[PDB]
């Protein structure tokens, strides 16, 4: 009653790939709610208010690329209204702040720091806007967000990611604008076709939670109509089950390439509050959400605020850099771990798991009725985790893993079990003295394309 | 008007990297190369799909000689027969005597374009004269992508898929309302990488199938093009679908959206052996390769194999002389020395003649004359100059002067043209010149170039 030759097939685009290999990225929330000590600004602010000190975006740069950071995604404008650059189409925005004298560019200043740091630079433009006169007369706001995408995404070098937030307070009796979606995606995709389209957009979906939650189970093959959720029985972004066999069995084709980003702050706002400077996550607390995310199919956009003293603050600079030495050790312990791996069938292709080559895999035969992967250490070893990794390029198709252990005596236990693996499963357990690893690969659908085995030591 | 939206609207990547091939053959085979027919007329036995000695590795060794990137195989065309055992239909090659029912030539096609280097595309006809679910509505919708689903799974990578939006019901026929948004979830799903092509939004037909090429070909265009071919009117046939008089009024509902000039090396699509001395020549060949490929436009050029099973002798022999002149042309290119110059920017002029796409001039702002000098070595008799924009970045380019400079220092205009977009090749009579120089004088905004010459072709 399903069918796997469709889902099992179902593959990311070239952008929805690249994307995917960044892993990790930050967002930047900074603005007039910078200065007001807001998390949503009630709009109208005088520009007056936004003068931050001593803005130095290197130093931003800077901590993110020690926190290993591949890109930035900064609000250009938030829901309260107010834009970081000098656009045409509206005065509320730095251009009649004091911040430069009235010269400031910030989209211009971060997108210029990113480029020397090596990141990759995405822009935020909420939907919802508390301050522009336009906003719920609707083709007249469509007409002033698409301007204000056409400033962003031609002035400014290349965009990875266009971040479109669903939230929306209007609420009861409040103001109603039925967004273009459809222009604005042409908008992004004719002027930054290599860009993701994120939230409310098709490329990237929104994991349901703003917590750091990631499912036990997460899917990136999911209904099409997930793509249309936050736009305005239901299916939500928030539904734990979106894509078993059970969820999408009654869509047939109506499925698509959607992947799960996991967004969350390193303190309890986004926005910078000093009264948060002592609840900033810390190295060891972002570092396990790290690897529950990274190794849990899940995108992780990490926001760290600069405060209105035109700094990331200390506690989030030494937790930035402790998770990039944590993140670095991690990779170069996978890197470097020796084993032999052997199979179940193909052992022709085994060597593709162990070789450290993203674009090489193992695939059992289609009649291997017990798909399995040994690796086995080069002397008894204390770990604690297994990772592995799909070719996703080539679909997802991970249903169910076992992992057993063999012990130096011989005798063998269960180590931990996990669904879905998709772009990396980081499966964690207690510290175990094992000789050799078996991965069970015992559901999937079709047969498992997997380029990457290893049994590790965080 | 508004030209920063316009002189950003750029190609994806798929559309980048199909631009790129430039040329690649289709190949009409089925039912109506044994019936010596044109359009089927659907329902025909298949046990008149008998083709003898069917050799895919003979049409790929005459595709490659005639330096094709690619194939596009006619699946299924309009009369409904399938070249594969679709698990949807029993109207297909498994209730033929072809290969005793055992064969599967979108297979034997595949692979042998995968032997030969080629790119693999297909062409499945929407309109379908057999199938019994063809204007019911989401019952032909699930049978088609039911065989999108085969065709875009078992075959490997996939670069097109063409969706012919030919239809002959007329006024009291079938009425089939095709979900095309449905298919192309199905297509992006499956084969992302893969252009949808005419009925479709990554590659637009332009408009004839004739070998016919625009004056002014523009990639950036109204997007309810990609709606015409779908069901004051704005037509693919028009001549002028992109000049700022037409697309002003569109604002942002515009995109990128470039023109696929398909043709037949003999007046028909299917092979009749009749027109087997109606087969374009080599000369006439080369002559289409550089007005579409010096035009802005992707040539689709079919070759129909026989109920023999081979590209008859002269369609081979045509492919061969086309492809030896367009190596010759890549040569005669490649051995060109000149030294550029430009008016404004001259640390980026080197540029223009590195033999690198990703390169490129591109004036300063206030340079009120963009122009390139391309100095020969000696006085050279050349016949044409190519200039292609960095159309990564958008196509920007609105009128272009050539002018020579003879060896007694006097001069001449040797042609113009409009657009450029991926290559312009503008051709004009023998001339033996000192040095070209190609006047940008009309552009919106700064032009990006990545390649200028001055050669003879
Ligand atoms: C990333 C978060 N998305 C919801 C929005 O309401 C919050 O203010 C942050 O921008
Ligand atoms: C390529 C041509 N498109 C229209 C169709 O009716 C013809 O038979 C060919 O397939
Ligand atoms: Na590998
Ligand atoms: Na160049």
Excluded at 341 to 357: E, F, I, K, Q
Excluded at 361 to 372: G, K, Q
Aim: proline letters at 5%; charged letters at 25%.
């Amino acid at each position: 009653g399903i069918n796997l030759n469709y889902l099992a097939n179902v593959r990311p685009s070239s952008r929805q790939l690249a994307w995917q290999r960044m892993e990790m990225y930050a967002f930047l929330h900074f603005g007039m709610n910078t200065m007001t000590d807001r998390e949503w600004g009630l709009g109208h602010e005088d520009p007056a208010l936004f003068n931050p000190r001593n803005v130095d975006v290197d130093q931003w740069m800077d901590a993110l690329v020690a926190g290993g950071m591949a890109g930035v995604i900064l609000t250009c404008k938030h829901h309260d209204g107010f834009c970081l650059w000098p656009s045409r189409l509206t005065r509320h925005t730095v251009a009649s702040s004091p911040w430069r004298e009235g010269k400031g560019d910030l989209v211009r200043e971060v997108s210029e720091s990113a480029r020397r740091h090596g990141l990759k630079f995405g822009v935020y433009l909420s939907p919802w806007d508390r301050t522009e006169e336009s906003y719920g007369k609707g083709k007249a706001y469509d007409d002033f967000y698409v301007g204000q995408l056409t400033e962003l995404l031609t002035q400014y070098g290349p965009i990875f990611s266009v971040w479109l937030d669903g939230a929306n307070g209007e609420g009861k009796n409040g103001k109603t604008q039925y967004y273009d979606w459809d222009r604005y995606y042409n908008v992004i995709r004719s002027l930054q076709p290599d860009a993701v389209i994120s939230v409310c957009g098709p490329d990237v979906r929104w994991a349901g939670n703003e917590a750091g939650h990631v499912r036990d189970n997460e899917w990136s093959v999911v209904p099409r109509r997930l793509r249309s959720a936050e736009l305005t029985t239901t299916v939500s972004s928030q539904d734990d089950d979106l894509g078993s066999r059970e969820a999408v069995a009654g869509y047939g084709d109506n499925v698509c390439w959607y992947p799960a980003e996991v967004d969350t702050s390193i303190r309890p706002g986004w926005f910078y509050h000093q009264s948060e400077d002592d609840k900033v996550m810390s190295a060891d607390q972002l570092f396990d959400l790290w690897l529950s995310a990274v190794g849990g199919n899940s995108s992780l956009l990490l926001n760290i605020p600069p405060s209105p003293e035109g700094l990331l603050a200390e506690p989030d600079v030494q937790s930035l850099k402790g998770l990039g030495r944590r993140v670095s050790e991690f990779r170069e312990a996978l890197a470097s771990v020796r084993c032999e791996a052997r199979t179940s069938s193909a052992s022709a292709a085994a060597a593709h798991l162990v070789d450290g080559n993203r674009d090489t895999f193992w695939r059992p035969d289609a009649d291997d009725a017990a798909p399995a992967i040994t690796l086995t250490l080069p002397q008894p070893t204390t770990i604690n985790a297994i990772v592995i990794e799909e070719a996703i390029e080539h679909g997802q198709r991970i249903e169910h893993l076992r992992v057993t252990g063999a012990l130096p005596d011989g005798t063998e236990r269960v180590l931990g079990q996990a669904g879905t693996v998709g772009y990396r499963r980081i499966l964690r357990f207690d510290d175990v003295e094992v000789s050799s690893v078996t991965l069970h690969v015992d559901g999937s659908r079709l047969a498992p394309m997997i380029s990457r085995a290893a049994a590790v030591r965080i």
